[PDB]
PDB file of all heavy atoms in Angstrom:
ATOM      1  N   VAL Y 332     -35.441  -1.071   0.566  1.00 16.61           N
ATOM      2  CA  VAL Y 332     -34.713   0.272   0.257  1.00 16.61           C
ATOM      3  C   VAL Y 332     -35.128   0.741  -1.003  1.00 16.61           C
ATOM      4  O   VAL Y 332     -35.030   0.021  -2.003  1.00 16.61           O
ATOM      5  CB  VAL Y 332     -33.190   0.086   0.397  1.00 16.61           C
ATOM      6  CG1 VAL Y 332     -32.879  -1.209  -0.323  1.00 16.61           C
ATOM      7  CG2 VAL Y 332     -32.441   1.289  -0.121  1.00 16.61           C
ATOM      8  N   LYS Y 333     -35.459   2.018  -1.140  1.00 16.57           N
ATOM      9  CA  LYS Y 333     -35.939   2.652  -2.413  1.00 16.57           C
ATOM     10  C   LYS Y 333     -35.811   4.208  -2.608  1.00 16.57           C
ATOM     11  O   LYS Y 333     -35.329   4.920  -1.659  1.00 16.57           O
ATOM     12  CB  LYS Y 333     -37.416   2.231  -2.541  1.00 16.57           C
ATOM     13  CG  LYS Y 333     -37.750   0.740  -2.738  1.00 16.57           C
ATOM     14  CD  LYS Y 333     -39.172   0.396  -2.813  1.00 16.57           C
ATOM     15  CE  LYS Y 333     -39.915   0.994  -4.051  1.00 16.57           C
ATOM     16  NZ  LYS Y 333     -41.414   0.755  -3.907  1.00 16.57           N
ATOM     17  N   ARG Y 334     -36.366   4.502  -3.785  1.00 11.66           N
ATOM     18  CA  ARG Y 334     -36.538   5.899  -4.100  1.00 11.66           C
ATOM     19  C   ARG Y 334     -35.186   6.621  -4.220  1.00 11.66           C
ATOM     20  O   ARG Y 334     -34.159   6.043  -4.313  1.00 11.66           O
ATOM     21  CB  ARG Y 334     -37.538   6.624  -3.226  1.00 11.66           C
ATOM     22  CG  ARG Y 334     -37.888   8.054  -3.563  1.00 11.66           C
ATOM     23  CD  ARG Y 334     -38.159   8.272  -5.155  1.00 11.66           C
ATOM     24  NE  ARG Y 334     -37.707   9.509  -5.631  1.00 11.66           N
ATOM     25  CZ  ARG Y 334     -36.977   9.809  -6.603  1.00 11.66           C
ATOM     26  NH1 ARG Y 334     -36.456   8.879  -7.460  1.00 11.66           N
ATOM     27  NH2 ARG Y 334     -36.630  10.986  -7.058  1.00 11.66           N
ATOM     28  N   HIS Y 335     -35.220   7.880  -4.410  1.00 12.84           N
ATOM     29  CA  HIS Y 335     -34.085   8.925  -4.197  1.00 12.84           C
ATOM     30  C   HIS Y 335     -33.370   9.026  -5.533  1.00 12.84           C
ATOM     31  O   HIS Y 335     -33.389   8.078  -6.432  1.00 12.84           O
ATOM     32  CB  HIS Y 335     -33.167   8.418  -3.097  1.00 12.84           C
ATOM     33  CG  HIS Y 335     -33.351   9.288  -1.765  1.00 12.84           C
ATOM     34  ND1 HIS Y 335     -33.015  10.612  -1.703  1.00 12.84           N
ATOM     35  CD2 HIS Y 335     -33.778   8.773  -0.568  1.00 12.84           C
ATOM     36  CE1 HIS Y 335     -33.208  10.940  -0.524  1.00 12.84           C
ATOM     37  NE2 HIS Y 335     -33.796   9.951   0.220  1.00 12.84           N
ATOM     38  N   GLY Y 336     -32.571  10.112  -5.649  1.00 13.29           N
ATOM     39  CA  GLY Y 336     -31.771  10.192  -6.767  1.00 13.29           C
ATOM     40  C   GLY Y 336     -30.303   9.707  -6.457  1.00 13.29           C
ATOM     41  O   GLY Y 336     -30.049   8.525  -6.824  1.00 13.29           O
ATOM     42  N   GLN Y 337     -29.539  10.534  -5.902  1.00 16.55           N
ATOM     43  CA  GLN Y 337     -28.112  10.135  -5.573  1.00 16.55           C
ATOM     44  C   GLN Y 337     -28.085   9.316  -4.353  1.00 16.55           C
ATOM     45  O   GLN Y 337     -27.452   8.344  -4.277  1.00 16.55           O
ATOM     46  CB  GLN Y 337     -27.286  11.438  -5.432  1.00 16.55           C
ATOM     47  CG  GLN Y 337     -27.171  12.091  -6.820  1.00 16.55           C
ATOM     48  CD  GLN Y 337     -26.253  13.310  -6.828  1.00 16.55           C
ATOM     49  OE1 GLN Y 337     -25.145  13.212  -7.219  1.00 16.55           O
ATOM     50  NE2 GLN Y 337     -26.605  14.397  -6.243  1.00 16.55           N
ATOM     51  N   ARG Y 338     -28.619   9.848  -3.284  1.00 15.14           N
ATOM     52  CA  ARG Y 338     -28.728   9.214  -1.898  1.00 15.14           C
ATOM     53  C   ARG Y 338     -29.835   8.181  -1.948  1.00 15.14           C
ATOM     54  O   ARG Y 338     -30.294   7.770  -3.069  1.00 15.14           O
ATOM     55  CB  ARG Y 338     -28.875  10.252  -0.821  1.00 15.14           C
ATOM     56  CG  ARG Y 338     -27.779  11.225  -0.764  1.00 15.14           C
ATOM     57  CD  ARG Y 338     -27.586  11.960   0.584  1.00 15.14           C
ATOM     58  NE  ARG Y 338     -28.617  12.861   0.892  1.00 15.14           N
ATOM     59  CZ  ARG Y 338     -29.749  12.435   1.576  1.00 15.14           C
ATOM     60  NH1 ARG Y 338     -29.852  11.200   2.050  1.00 15.14           N
ATOM     61  NH2 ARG Y 338     -30.753  13.323   1.810  1.00 15.14           N
ATOM     62  N   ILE Y 339     -30.044   7.506  -0.824  1.00 15.53           N
ATOM     63  CA  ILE Y 339     -31.143   6.558  -0.758  1.00 15.53           C
ATOM     64  C   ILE Y 339     -31.827   6.313   0.557  1.00 15.53           C
ATOM     65  O   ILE Y 339     -31.281   6.585   1.567  1.00 15.53           O
ATOM     66  CB  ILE Y 339     -30.463   5.087  -1.156  1.00 15.53           C
ATOM     67  CG1 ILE Y 339     -31.515   4.168  -1.773  1.00 15.53           C
ATOM     68  CG2 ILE Y 339     -29.800   4.433   0.102  1.00 15.53           C
ATOM     69  CD1 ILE Y 339     -31.874   4.579  -3.199  1.00 15.53           C
ATOM     70  N   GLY Y 340     -33.119   5.853   0.490  1.00 18.17           N
ATOM     71  CA  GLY Y 340     -33.885   5.657   1.635  1.00 18.17           C
ATOM     72  C   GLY Y 340     -34.255   4.281   1.922  1.00 18.17           C
ATOM     73  O   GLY Y 340     -34.713   3.521   0.976  1.00 18.17           O
ATOM     74  N   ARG Y 341     -34.101   3.812   3.115  1.00 17.28           N
ATOM     75  CA  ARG Y 341     -34.511   2.425   3.582  1.00 17.28           C
ATOM     76  C   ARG Y 341     -35.593   2.552   4.658  1.00 17.28           C
ATOM     77  O   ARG Y 341     -35.659   3.468   5.465  1.00 17.28           O
ATOM     78  CB  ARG Y 341     -33.222   1.728   4.111  1.00 17.28           C
ATOM     79  CG  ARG Y 341     -33.498   0.378   4.810  1.00 17.28           C
ATOM     80  CD  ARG Y 341     -32.737  -0.756   4.268  1.00 17.28           C
ATOM     81  NE  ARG Y 341     -33.123  -1.980   5.063  1.00 17.28           N
ATOM     82  CZ  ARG Y 341     -32.366  -3.171   4.923  1.00 17.28           C
ATOM     83  NH1 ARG Y 341     -31.359  -3.288   4.060  1.00 17.28           N
ATOM     84  NH2 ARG Y 341     -32.796  -4.156   5.687  1.00 17.28           N
ATOM     85  N   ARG Y 342     -36.468   1.480   4.673  1.00 18.36           N
ATOM     86  CA  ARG Y 342     -37.484   1.235   5.722  1.00 18.36           C
ATOM     87  C   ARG Y 342     -36.926   0.412   6.801  1.00 18.36           C
ATOM     88  O   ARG Y 342     -35.805  -0.024   6.871  1.00 18.36           O
ATOM     89  CB  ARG Y 342     -38.650   0.544   5.040  1.00 18.36           C
ATOM     90  CG  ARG Y 342     -39.466   1.393   4.099  1.00 18.36           C
ATOM     91  CD  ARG Y 342     -40.591   0.714   3.409  1.00 18.36           C
ATOM     92  NE  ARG Y 342     -41.412   1.473   2.713  1.00 18.36           N
ATOM     93  CZ  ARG Y 342     -42.337   1.050   1.960  1.00 18.36           C
ATOM     94  NH1 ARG Y 342     -42.543  -0.216   1.788  1.00 18.36           N
ATOM     95  NH2 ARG Y 342     -43.001   1.877   1.185  1.00 18.36           N
TER      96      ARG Y 342
END
Side-chain angles (χ1 to χ4, degrees):
Chain Y
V332 45
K333 292 176 66 185
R334 185 43 216 128
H335 258 292
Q337 295 187 101
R338 298 202 294 90
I339 208 73
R341 173 124 178 194
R342 292 175 172 171

